[PDB]
Amino acid sequence: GSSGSSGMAKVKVLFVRNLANTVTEEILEKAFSQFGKLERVKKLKDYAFIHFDERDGAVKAMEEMNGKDLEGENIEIVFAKPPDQKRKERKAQRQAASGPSSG
């Protein structure tokens, strides 16, 4: 059936969105703190990222706050993607066939 969705991820950072107009890093801490030791909080346009000292501390504050009425707004928490970026490239191709001529 369409029960829902389940899985397993090794992410410590929690992606919280749908923040109110009175929500700040300080509020995101104390809230996502009581659960477990926090590392840092990054606020954005409307959403923000909650950094947890441990991957566990998050899982808790995640399934605990996930969809909680924060400041009168139901915020959504989803395991954010890990910071993995790079520019890989390697090739070898060069040739020039001028081949002059006259009339």
Question: Beta strand 73-79 with 38-43: parallel, antiparallel or unpaired?
Answer: unpaired
**Domain with 103 in it: what CATH number?**
3.30.70.330
Burial grade of 9 (CB within 10 A; 0-12, 13-18, 19 or more): middle
Find the helix packing angle between 55-65 and 25-35, rounded to 10°.
Answer: 100
Length of the chain: 103
Q: Give 29's contacts (C-beta < 8 A, 6+ positions apart).
A: 38, 41
Total domains present in the chain: 1
The parent domain of residue 73 ranges over 1-103
Angle at 74 between CA 46 and CA 84, to 5 degrees: 50
CA dist 64 and 58 (Å) reads 9
Contact 38, 49 (CB under 8 A): no
Intra-chain end-to-end CA distance of the chain, in Å: 81
* Beta bridge pairs of residue 73: 70
